[PDB]
Design a protein around this ligand. Structure first.
Ligand SMILES: NS(=O)(=O)c1cc2c(cc1Cl)N[C@H]([C@H]1C[C@H]3C=C[C@@H]1C3)NS2(=O)=O
Ligand SMILES: NS(=O)(=O)c1cc2c(cc1Cl)N[C@H]([C@H]1C[C@H]3C=C[C@@H]1C3)NS2(=O)=O
Lengths: 49, 49, 49
């Protein structure tokens, strides 16, 4: 009861949670969600016209 | 969880109720029906369904 | 909080320590040093700075 509060006070829980969830951003959208591609227009875009 | 009609707690619960195991640092959820047989510290990580 | 250099709890925590009160239903933050003089239940509402 006194030890868990020490970890919560000093942010050790935050450091461990960052280590075991956020430092292993692996799959797709987390890494590649903030990038940019320009364009290339294909026919599948313009067909109803 | 407990057994019907015999209250036989299996799993990690009975390991602490029946004097088998000494401590359990594990993903265990504080409920109402678990405080009567074992004791929990202050919670260290929040979540939801 | 405790006073500087005297360890005299003013406020509501002093009302629980010095025998003046009985219970404190209040927006009170579970810190470290408040555990050593009184007792808390499980937390009921979570927040942050
Ligand atoms: N952001 S989190 O879920 O990983 C998380 C969750 C919690 C932490 C610390 C972290 Cl890092 N400590 C709190 C404790 C601190 C104090 C206040 C309540 C408890 C005592 N319990 S908690 O609310 O369960
Ligand atoms: N979403 S919240 O901050 O208002 C909030 C926060 C908490 C609630 C319930 C609510 Cl609604 N109950 C939990 C307790 C209930 C059970 C499960 C963990 C603890 C035991 N404490 S808590 O994590 O402090």
């Amino acid at each position: 009861n006194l030890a868990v509060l020490k970890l919560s006070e000093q942010g050790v829980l935050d450091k461990l949670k960052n280590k075991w969830w956020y430092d292993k951003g692996e799959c797709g959208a987390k890494d590649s969600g903030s990038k940019e591609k320009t364009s290339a227009l294909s026919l599948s875009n313009v067909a109803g016209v | 969880a407990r057994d019907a009609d015999t209250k036989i707690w299996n799993g990690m619960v009975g390991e602490l109720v029946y004097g088998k195991a000494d401590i359990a640092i594990a993903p265990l959820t504080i409920t109402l029906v678990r405080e009567e047989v074992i004791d929990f510290s202050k919670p260290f990580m929040s979540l939801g369904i």
